[PDB]
Write a protein that binds this ligand. Structure first.
Ligand SMILES: Cc1cccc(NC(=O)[C@@H]2CCCN2)n1
Ligand SMILES: Cc1cccc(NC(=O)[C@@H]2CCCN2)n1
Lengths: 265, 263
């Protein structure tokens, strides 16, 4: 792991582990999501962070994921080396954006890519707020000035509006509770757990015969350690499209909504 | 990762990750358990393999019967941990795999583990003893003299574990494995059972104590569509008796003990 020559992006190589792969002997989307999270943490640390700025720590402010979009072309196999390059960019007063590029270390080809939108939030009240000018100047020195997008395209699927799943759902997984392994160092539910929960309502036959190509997730609320979640899915469509919804088992309070795209093996 | 000079043990270094640590910014016991599992896989791959030639022919696999882990120091986020692992034959009973955990900077032993594996027909799940034809093909990869991570006589790794009596002091019910809890063969990962056992331990004990020892006896395998109940009772430092059983019929899948020290 190290910053590039300009110090405006970070790269890191990972060797895929035995417990990180699924039935096809290739990394699961949750292993990929964990690796993107790890390379992002190492980028923040290499440029002197802990990724709250000095003004953010004084004002009790944190960065929270509002959207996560992951597109995979090839899943690295058990024992393969994957190289991930990551960088951040300012999106004015709306918040920050973090992008990733996944490459096979042997061939050098792009085997995946991801984009995420982060919004500023008061750690205590959970009220979102626009990025002030004092905060923007502290993280602009670590971002490229010209726009560098993992999903540049004229009409990329990373900025598409996601509708709300209508009851009844076609498929469902009820009673999902996070355990201690699902909590981070700050005792909050890890963002990768929501991905695993969304995919729990997808039938095992679809998983066994299709590969996950795209996943877009919109985060609306955070799930607590003592909260129970219901995962809901409906087919919207070789390819297979699904609409997803995560809500609290009790009151039905929405925590997440998303879409997945799968292709035939 | 590489075998040692004699080719009778394997070493590998790991840099502790952000998502691998708990609230005290040190690796969880499940991260340690996953790393031991990974170094064991890499040892088997480096010597030409889990199943052997005459084991695939007879549909036979190795299954964990017991896991015993003792931790002195939990590696912190960003630290390098070196793990050395080796196997040994235990006659016709089965195989044993041992591990030594060391801080890569200080060279100090910060943990150690031992596990007992029994032979089983993959299809019928019947145990049966080890034959001499399989013993000879794995003896060339094991030290001949006994090399034990837990040498001391009358140690915590070979102690009989009793069955938890109802009612349990603490409990966590309705535990279901997800796809992330399944390995490449769609079986529940043995590290998930550790996480499930520790779910019935109260959060106050976790927040004020550190896990020093964990011993687990595996009796039955949990299926993907099975639901588990985790039960705990204080037997005492803090000692606990544990039991994992199926939520329905109450069929025992695991039993164990944990030991915790005040921070
Ligand atoms: C965008 C996003 C992601 C995750 C959590 C949240 N928000 C909250 O947890 C609470 C709900 C009321 C407002 N803030 N927002
Ligand atoms: C020692 C051990 C560990 C894990 C599973 C099993 N055995 C079984 O799954 C079943 C139970 C009775 C027939 N074999 N044994």
């Amino acid at each position: 792991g190290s910053l590039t020559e300009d110090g405006l992006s970070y790269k890191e190589k990972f060797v895929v582990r035995s417990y990180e792969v699924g039935s096809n002997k290739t990394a699961t989307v949750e292993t990929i999501a964990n690796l993107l999270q790890e390379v992002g943490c190492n980028h923040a640390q290499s440029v002197g962070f802990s990724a709250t700025t000095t003004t953010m720590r004084k004002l009790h402010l944190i960065w929270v994921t509002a959207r996560m979009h992951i597109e995979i072309y090839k899943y690295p196999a058990w024992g393969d080396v994957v190289e991930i390059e990551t960088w951040c960019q300012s999106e004015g007063r709306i918040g920050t954006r973090r992008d990733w590029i996944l490459k096979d270390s042997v061939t050098g080809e792009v085997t995946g890519r991801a984009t995420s939108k982060w919004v500023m939030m008061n750690q205590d009240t959970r009220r979102l707020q626009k990025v002030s000018d004092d905060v923007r100047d502290e993280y602009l020195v670590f971002c490229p000035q010209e726009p560098r997008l993992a999903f540049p395209e004229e009409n990329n699927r990373s900025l598409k509006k996601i509708p709300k799943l209508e009851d009844p759902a076609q498929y469902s997984m009820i009673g999902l509770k996070p355990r201690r392994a699902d909590l981070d160092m700050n005792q909050h539910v890890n963002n990768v757990t929501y991905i695993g929960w969304v995919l729990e309502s997808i039938p095992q036959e679809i998983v066994d015969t299709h590969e996950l190509q795209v996943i877009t997730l919109d985060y609306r609320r955070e799930c607590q350690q003592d909260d129970v979640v219901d995962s809901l899915t409906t087919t919207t469509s070789n390819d297979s499209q699904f609409l997803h919804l995560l809500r609290l088992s009790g009151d039905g309070q929405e925590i997440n909504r998303g879409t997945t795209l799968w292709r035939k093996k």
